Structure 1
Amino acid sequence: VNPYIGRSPLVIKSYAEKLEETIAYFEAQGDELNAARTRTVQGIPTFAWISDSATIDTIQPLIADAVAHQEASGEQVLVQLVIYNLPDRDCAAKASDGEFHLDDDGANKYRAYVDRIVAELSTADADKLHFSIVLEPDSLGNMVTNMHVPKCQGAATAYKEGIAYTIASLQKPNIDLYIDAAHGGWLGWNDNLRPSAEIFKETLDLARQITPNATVRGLAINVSNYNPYKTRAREDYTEWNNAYDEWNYVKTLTPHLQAVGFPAQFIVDQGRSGREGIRTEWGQWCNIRNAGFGIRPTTDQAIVDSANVDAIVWVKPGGESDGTSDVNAVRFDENCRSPASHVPAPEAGEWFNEFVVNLVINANPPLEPTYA
């Protein structure tokens, strides 16, 4: 069943608190409407990212808060998590902050990291909640398009085995799993569709060798990207790609999933998808200037318009930087000084207030204000 129907995805308190800085900015500008729109954003659920082992410490307090909120509100709280820590993570990138490396016992360390997450998701409080979990952004797409990269060659089996273990470890009636499936500009190209479907099925089959009847709900798409759900003005860079918006990516990928016997249900990130025409190349990803908040999280089929889409969601939390633009930073990524990038920008994950200001202003549909 679509686990989003009737459920109330969890508002992440630590994220909402960061937005107080954005509210303060707008109030100082004498801009009460945008201050009020920012308050609306405080009440919009986002995914909590578990991108390292230290962040596992945040999970039980998050669950305790979620249970208290469920008791107070009478809602069916749906905790949304991203698991993002494969060994030799981000294999095609020049650099990765992933803490596990295959040559330093990374496969076994990843299993234990998963095991630590499982322990937190197996408490009496956890049992009271429902979870939606996105598995491993920036992973399996690399096996489709980046097998000429030595690091990807050496990580391919590990990515499949790692995700397989995560799937096999999180089979519970109150957990739905979505394997990350990149975005239309990566895997939507004609020649990438079938091998993508095949690798998702291959990974699920490996999971079933660990836990016999293991399943996933489907796929997560556009995570951390900017692609529109339905484009208003198709971009020139999408020429010869039938997945020129994320709704079309669903429609174009679905038949291949069906053909290989992989579940064809999707959740779609639209947290930074409000404004189009912000990039000159599809591969630009880092802090794209003038990005807007997109369609708010919803299951409404009048918007979603696809039996294959469970929900539009906000996975990457807008305002958390994609990377620093400082040329001298230890983790400097040249992509973060692209012609389309918002500069200056802070370290990946750090608060980028100027960028959130623009996310509010460029939101589409416009944000409805929340007034006290």
Structure 2
Amino acid sequence: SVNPYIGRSPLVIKSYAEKLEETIAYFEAQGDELNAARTRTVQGIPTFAWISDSATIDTIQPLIADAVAHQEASGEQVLVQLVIYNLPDRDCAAKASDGEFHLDDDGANKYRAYVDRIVAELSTADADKLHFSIVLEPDSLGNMVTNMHVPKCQGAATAYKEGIAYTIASLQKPNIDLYIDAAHGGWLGWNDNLRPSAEIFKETLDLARQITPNATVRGLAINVSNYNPYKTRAREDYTEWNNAYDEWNYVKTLTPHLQAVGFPAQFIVDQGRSGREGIRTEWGQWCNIRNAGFGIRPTTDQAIVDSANVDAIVWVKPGGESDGTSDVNAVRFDENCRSPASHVPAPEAGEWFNEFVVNLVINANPPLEPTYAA
């Protein structure tokens, strides 16, 4: 197994880049050409494409066709980055989940068929020309470590392991690298959470190997949709007694446990919203955190990454797509989205939050280099 990111060009998601035209127009109207140009830079930064429901499977083949055309035109080794996010009884510790599959409505079998539909799209002649990096199931297995007092999590534990195992077993190809989601330092980095986390990742991989005999994964994805810095400048008070107080330290502290159980210790790390620290009063604040900045841009450069266990810094959650609505009356209202640290008003989850992106640009660290036309 080799670092699939080296020499590869992660795919710019066209549908995401187009959304940033609104942000460019805002800055232009402010007479702010530097930030308009920084936003153009952001348009050229690769992000992950999320497959968070069955309908979104329809976007995969057009994405692939575009990717192949780009590979032909550019001569790059295109690396398509995807998130698979649709377990049955998804998000078991949340008051509400938008996940479309439910265990009491044939959800386990429906999830397998959803995976099978993804497999078909990733098995075309065009798909074979590309390489894929796929994050498996954010907000899943950490619940088995810390949320087993929750009835829905108790009832979903076996299904989460079996579901992810099927996804792993179904996506063994030379041109696909898989990263199991492993939450973030503030969730699983606490001393007593490290070993059970490593064990559950290994347990899930072992289940996968009972389906497809020599099945492997590349490793883990961390900080997905969160804000934790890679290397903290000013270590925050809420991290007290947690040795995973930034994501680089999460890697360093989790790695020995992975090694002990025989699970691959290679990581990709989301930094898309990690540029600004001191934006939260509690580690568990996650929804549209105000003044978040774009973080370290996607890179494999070891001068920045500074760990043999880290394949790449990546941008998984696409900045500007809302984490949830702030409207108390909304059918999908989540009270976390009115936390004292949240940016309000915020639109429905997934909808474009332009004011938030304006701030992501302004608060980026390192500052964004502008892209000016020739």
Q: Same fold (TM over 0.5)?
A: yes
Paired with 1:134 and 1:91, the residues of 2 have a C-alpha distance of 19
* Alpha-carbon distance, 1:21 to partner: 0.1
* Alpha-carbon distance, 1:160 to partner: 0.1
* Alpha-carbon distance, 1:236 to partner: 0.1
Paired with 1:8 and 1:297, the residues of 2 have a C-alpha distance of 10
* Alpha-carbon distance, 1:230 to partner: 0.1
Paired with 2:74 and 2:250, the residues of 1 have a C-alpha distance of 36
Deviations 1:228-278 (A, max 9, x none): 000000000000000000000000000000000000000000000000000
* Alpha-carbon distance, 1:327 to partner: 0.2
Paired with 1:48 and 1:35, the residues of 2 have a C-alpha distance of 24
Deviations 1:66-121 (A, max 9, x none): 00000000000000000000000000000000000000000000000000000000
What SS does the aligned partner of 2:82 have?
A: strand
Paired with 1:92 and 1:333, the residues of 2 have a C-alpha distance of 13
Residue 308 (str. 1) matches residue 274 (str. 2)? no
Paired with 1:341 and 1:142, the residues of 2 have a C-alpha distance of 23
Q: State the TM-score, normalizing by the size of structure 2.
A: 0.99
Deviations 1:19-78 (A, max 9, x none): 000000000000000000000000000000000000000000000000000000000000
* Alpha-carbon distance, 1:370 to partner: 0.1
Matched with 1:225 is 226
* Alpha-carbon distance, 1:136 to partner: 0.1
Paired with 2:200 and 2:85, the residues of 1 have a C-alpha distance of 18
Matched with 2:321 is 320
* Alpha-carbon distance, 1:335 to partner: 0.2
* Alpha-carbon distance, 1:303 to partner: 0.1
> What RMSD, in angstroms, separates the aligned Cα atoms of the two structures?
0.2
Paired with 2:251 and 2:112, the residues of 1 have a C-alpha distance of 31
Matched with 1:149 is 150
The number of residue pairs the alignment matches comes to: 372
What SS does the aligned partner of 2:254 have?
A: helix
Paired with 2:348 and 2:75, the residues of 1 have a C-alpha distance of 38
Matched with 1:35 is 36
What SS does the aligned partner of 1:219 have?
A: strand
Paired with 2:185 and 2:72, the residues of 1 have a C-alpha distance of 40
Q: State the TM-score, normalizing by the size of structure 1.
A: 1.00
Residue 249 (str. 1) matches residue 250 (str. 2)? yes
* Alpha-carbon distance, 1:155 to partner: 0.1
What SS does the aligned partner of 2:133 have?
A: strand
What SS does the aligned partner of 1:162 have?
A: helix
* Alpha-carbon distance, 1:179 to partner: 0.0
Gaps of 5+ in 1: none
Paired with 1:161 and 1:324, the residues of 2 have a C-alpha distance of 32
Paired with 1:349 and 1:303, the residues of 2 have a C-alpha distance of 30
Paired with 1:348 and 1:225, the residues of 2 have a C-alpha distance of 15
Matched with 1:164 is 165
Paired with 1:350 and 1:325, the residues of 2 have a C-alpha distance of 12
Paired with 1:192 and 1:88, the residues of 2 have a C-alpha distance of 23
* Alpha-carbon distance, 1:321 to partner: 0.1
What SS does the aligned partner of 2:113 have?
A: helix
Segments of 4+ moved more than 3 angstroms:
none
Paired with 2:99 and 2:184, the residues of 1 have a C-alpha distance of 21
Paired with 2:64 and 2:356, the residues of 1 have a C-alpha distance of 29
- 5 Å-filtered alignment, 1:336-355, equals 336-355=337-356
* Alpha-carbon distance, 1:210 to partner: 0.0
Matched with 1:363 is 364
Matched with 2:204 is 203
What SS does the aligned partner of 2:101 have?
A: coil
Deviations 1:272-294 (A, max 9, x none): 00000000000000000000000
Deviations 1:321-353 (A, max 9, x none): 000000000000000000000000000000000
* Alpha-carbon distance, 1:219 to partner: 0.0
* Alpha-carbon distance, 1:124 to partner: 0.1
What SS does the aligned partner of 1:272 have?
A: coil
* Alpha-carbon distance, 1:142 to partner: 0.1
Paired with 1:165 and 1:322, the residues of 2 have a C-alpha distance of 28
Paired with 1:347 and 1:192, the residues of 2 have a C-alpha distance of 32
Paired with 1:285 and 1:15, the residues of 2 have a C-alpha distance of 21
Gaps of 5+ in 2: none
Paired with 1:309 and 1:186, the residues of 2 have a C-alpha distance of 19
Deviations 1:97-152 (A, max 9, x none): 00000000000000000000000000000000000000000000000000000000
* Alpha-carbon distance, 1:304 to partner: 0.1
Deviations 1:293-324 (A, max 9, x none): 00000000000000000000000000000000
What SS does the aligned partner of 1:268 have?
A: strand
* Alpha-carbon distance, 1:168 to partner: 0.0
* Alpha-carbon distance, 1:189 to partner: 0.2
Paired with 2:317 and 2:344, the residues of 1 have a C-alpha distance of 19
* Alpha-carbon distance, 1:218 to partner: 0.0
Paired with 2:47 and 2:350, the residues of 1 have a C-alpha distance of 14
* Alpha-carbon distance, 1:6 to partner: 0.1
